[model samples]
Target: NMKEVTQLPEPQTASLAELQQMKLFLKLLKKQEKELKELERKGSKRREELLQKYSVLFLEPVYPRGLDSQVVELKERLEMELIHLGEEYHDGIRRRKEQHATEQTAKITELAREKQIAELKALKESSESNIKDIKKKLEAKRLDRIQVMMRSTSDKAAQERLKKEINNSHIQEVVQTIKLLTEKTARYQQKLEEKQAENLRAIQEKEGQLQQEAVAEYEEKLKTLTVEVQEMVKNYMKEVFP
Candidate 1:
């Protein structure tokens, strides 16, 4: 007599690229496959936008509102329900998802904008501190000049003239310092803006690449499937009409 048992297979290894490919197929590719299959199975492309939402040869679909985790869960629910629901319910579901997506997008955008503002303000504050320190040193230097000039001139009239010129010098220095500080702050802000713009460009470029790749992959698969369908139709016609 013998007892039944299961044994493990040998250990396997994979390269980084292979693992990433596996992950993409297991996660995003599988979801896209199931979604397109369901939509095609329904036998109607009544709403162009609705059909495109399932197909990858078009632009990305809008998603629903709420936390990301909740949004993903609700989206999966809606996609599944759409497969079983009647036309009467389809419009209602699509509308609800659109409303939810718009509201959520607005909410997220506002939050990011506010956060950026706060960070910029903090950076400005730090930068302004540098101007404040410069002003402090400038004032101290002005006082030292005044003391040296008063000590060097012993004649009363000459001392008065020197003091007047010193006053004018102080005003000119103040104006120049104010202009310098303003320019410095403006330059800092401009540099920061350029850096942020560059970063945003990179992110958008990456997203575009991913979107284009998805479309290309889907179109290739559809092309193959179309060829198969045409061949099948030709064979069936020969069999039935002959």
Candidate 2:
């Protein structure tokens, strides 16, 4: 039904495009994760150093409970900041992943549509060729029958009547064969359309599932980061107070 299906890239080229995009997405994600890890490591180191410095100050007579309050406040603030940083990192990663999925889905849909249309075009061509072949064979057979009848009959009227009958029979056969072929082709066309629709639906469903999985994973990681930061703050507070 499509008048023109857009040309598709070579198989190798299409695969390369998808592969390169995937690689780039993975590389960026890894880099961002590594940066987050380094930042967290530095933050932990600084927290430990601060704790040691405060311990030393706590031993002094000049520093009172007020100093302890200040330390507790500082610890709480650091914990909040750490959690906020983790959330920001998670948000950025989610956005990047969503963008990657969108692009990949579009590419997949385009490729699928192109392939279906190309196959449909091929089917039409092959069906046309089949009809042409049948037509040629029918014509040849009809002419052969006419020649045979001419040799058998000497009466002109009989020859004419028989020739008309032969023509009528051949015409009926041709029409019947063509109708059957056309119906078969139409059925195949319908099936192909249904298959294309099903494929698109499956692709969309898979994309949706992938996105949900990614979101769940990100949320879990964010929760772990929050808990770890909370534990660190709790330990620091206990050590400073005691």
Candidate 3:
């Protein structure tokens, strides 16, 4: 299959064109290997330089040179930018939490009221004579004030207020349930925020882990591949010309 087709074995048996193509591709890989070696060498040299720089700062106490000045200057810049970025990130998270919390709290509160009112109404419809009689009395109280306003004429605000009070009295149970729900919801929300902060602290700890050095085996394998590839071309040329 495709994997077999892409396979590169030592002393590959192939036509001149395939050999030439393989040689050219190997050259390209060699170019990449060169770059990787250069970069890896520089990183090693930089590590040694950093060690010397730290020793100078701790023991010698002379003016900084080489990578030390760059590191210090870059660290200061990173701190400055981080102060600004960290504040903005915190503000953004706070803003979204407030928005979402209010929406959820209001949502649950309204839902609780609706569900309780429906239950109350269902009970009123199904219960025995006593329940029906009590509801009838409350309904009459709600209507009498509004009816009196219509017939006798009265202050509009007072009439509206009286009607409103009677209506609210009808759902006092539901209102109380909603109030209880809201208070409980606030406590739960406080716990939720505490948990969120704990999770964030865990995430920050994970991200703060010290970085590791790149693997050495990779460079070793790359060097091996480069030599093997060059040898393939050399062997092919010997068969073709010599």
Candidate 4:
């Protein structure tokens, strides 16, 4: 299901320490939770394979040798222990998915987020494009005030007062906020990027580990097969000689 992400104030990234302690760490927590579940899944898969393989072998003796039977029995015991491990592995995946969904994203929160973004956008546009428009209005007002002064006893003072009052201090404050806010946005973007890069690096590292594990598993199988083949050949040679 498509779930909404958290719209809490753009997470604090005012300082590198805060980024690490808060926003990036939150991402890391998300990453680790998923990672641990995956690790459990892989472990369970390998363990289940080993258990099932040995269970069948132990059910019917692998060889005439008592040693072989004893080895099979031991593998069966390990299989019994790992049954719960596999269940836990599967449950963890489900649990995490559910927990992530439980995180709230109600409509009010969404509206609030949109409103904030809109405010920021307005401030950005004003700073970049509308300053000239504002200047023209000021010039026009100045001309009007001068004309009114020519018609009045002390209109100049009154006109100056009007100019001061109508001046958009609110807009200026918002522009300043935008400038500060943009700096904050950039800091957050940079930190998120770094965290993302680290996340990728971690995944790449794990992939390398998985590759090696797979290769080692194949190598181990080959070694076992080779030993079994050599033993069969030697036995055949003894039989032929005798």
Q: What does candidate 1's lDDT look like per residue over 34-127, in tens digits?
A: 5555655553454334434434422245565654654345344434434433333334333433443344334333443454566568566755
Any residue pairs clashing in model 1, and if so which?
A: none
Q: Rank by lDDT, highest first.
A: 2, 1, 4, 3
> How do all the candidates rank in terms of TM-score, highest first?
2, 1, 4, 3
Worst 10 residues of 1 by lDDT: 1-10
Off by over 4 Å in 3: 1-74, 127-242
List model 2 lDDT by residue over 184-228, tens digit each.
778777777776777777767766876786688688878699788
* lDDT string, candidate 3, 1-242, tens digits: 22222221122122222322444445644664565566556645754454344444434444646655554553344344434433443344444334433443343334434434554443333333333444565567667756865666567877677767767776673445444434544454455445444544443343233111122333344445445434543453354336
TM-score of 4: 0.33
Clashing pairs in 2: none
Question: How much is 53 displaced in model 4, in angstroms?
Answer: 27
Question: Which candidate number maximizes lDDT?
Answer: 2
Best by TM-score: 2
Q: Pairing residues by index, what is the TM-score of model 3?
A: 0.24
Candidate 2: 10-residue stretch with minimal lDDT: 1-10
